[PDB]
Amino acid sequence: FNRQIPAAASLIQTAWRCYAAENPDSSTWKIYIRISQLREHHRATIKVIRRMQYFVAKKKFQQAR
Amino acid sequence: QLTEEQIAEFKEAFSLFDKDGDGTITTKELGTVMRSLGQNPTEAELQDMINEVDADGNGTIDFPEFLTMMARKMKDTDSEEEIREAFRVFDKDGNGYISAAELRHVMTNLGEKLTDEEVDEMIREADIDGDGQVNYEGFVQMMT
Ligand SMILES: [Ca+2]
Ligand SMILES: [Ca+2]
């Protein structure tokens, strides 16, 4: 009932994760538990992936509208 | 719009996905990066990611496409309204406002499921007045 709810949340969540990752001391950087010392090459790939995931969540939100 | 330094950081970013160095990023290259970060994507996730960036349709991403993506001004690019429309899904009044508690529920328990630490920053930056009701149209402007 209302598939717009998961897509809505995911669009906001990805938009904010993309925004917060511009601050390199954000708590959003703590979620990669499986990496020991977050180096700067991790951060460059993480920001690309987050941008890619935001554009996907944008797509699936538009699709549910 | 784009510095010579921004393009260079983007080229270094492109190099970290293009392991083989052929100048394109395949879905399998992206899955290797994502698993190195502790993610476990499926082939369809990776294809969804690639199809949003691939402009010609070959199923792989070259540096012009990667740069087009990384430099898309996600702020005025009609994105503000879709995030509003996203927030409106949970605004059961038209209030333009959403309780901090409702927000924490939706953010922590649905969709991507954010961490409680992450929902602290979000709620903290967005509750301008500090009474437990955030107005999402101001938060939208802040993210953009
Ligand atoms: Ca390659
Ligand atoms: Ca291509």
Q: What is the 3-state secondary structure (H, E, C) of chain B?
A: CCCHHHHHHHHHHHHHHCCCCCCEECHHHHHHHHHHCCCCCCHHHHHHHHHHHCCCCCCCEEHHHHHHHHCCCCCCCCHHHHHHHHHHCCCCCCCCEEEHHHHHHHHHHCCCCCCHHHHHHHHHHHCCCCCCEEEHHHHHHHHC
Contact B132, B100 (CB under 8 A): yes
The residue assigned the tokens 């996600």 is B74
The separation between the first and the last C-alpha atoms of chain A, rounded to the nearest angstrom, is: 14
The residue assigned the tokens 């499986």 is A34
Three-class secondary structure of residue A4 per DSSP? helix
B113: left (phi over 0), alpha (psi -120 to 50) or beta: left
Identify the sign of the CA torsion A29, A31, A32, A33. positive
Find the helix packing angle between B136-143 and A4-20, rounded to 10°.
50
Identify the sign of the CA torsion B86, B89, B93, B99. negative
- Number of CB atoms found within 10 A of residue B104's CB: 16
Three-class secondary structure of residue A5 per DSSP? helix
Contacts of A29 (CB under 8 A, 6+ apart): A21, A38, A43
Contacts of B22 (CB under 8 A, 6+ apart): none
Contact A62, A19 (CB under 8 A): no
How many helices and strands in chain A, by DSSP H and E? Answer: 2, 0
Please, which residues bridge with residue B133 across strands? B99
Contact B67, B4 (CB under 8 A): no
Residues with CB under 5 A from ligand 1 (ion): B 18, 20, 22
DSSP code for A23: S
What was the experiment behind these coordinates? Answer: X-ray
Provide the shortest C-alpha distance from residue B112 to chain A (in Å): 6
- Number of CB atoms found within 10 A of residue B47's CB: 15
> Which site among A13, A28, A33, A54 would you substitute to test the B interface, given the most B Cβ atoms closer than 10 Å to its Cβ?
A13
- Kindly give the distance from the C-alpha atom of residue A40 to the centroid of ligand 2, in angstroms, as a whole number: 27
Length of chain B measured in residues: 144
Contact B111, A10 (CB under 8 A): yes
Burial level of A27, CB count in 10 A (0-12/13-18/19+)?
Answer: middle
Contact A26, B120 (CB under 8 A): no
- Among B16, B86, B121, select the one facing A12 at the smallest CB separation: B86
- Among A26, A35, A48, select the one facing B13 at the smallest CB separation: A48
B111: left (phi over 0), alpha (psi -120 to 50) or beta: left
The residue assigned the tokens 């083989």 is B20
- Kindly give the distance from the C-alpha atom of residue B57 to the centroid of ligand 2, in angstroms, as a whole number: 6
- Kindly give the distance from the C-alpha atom of residue B25 to the centroid of ligand 1, in angstroms, as a whole number: 5
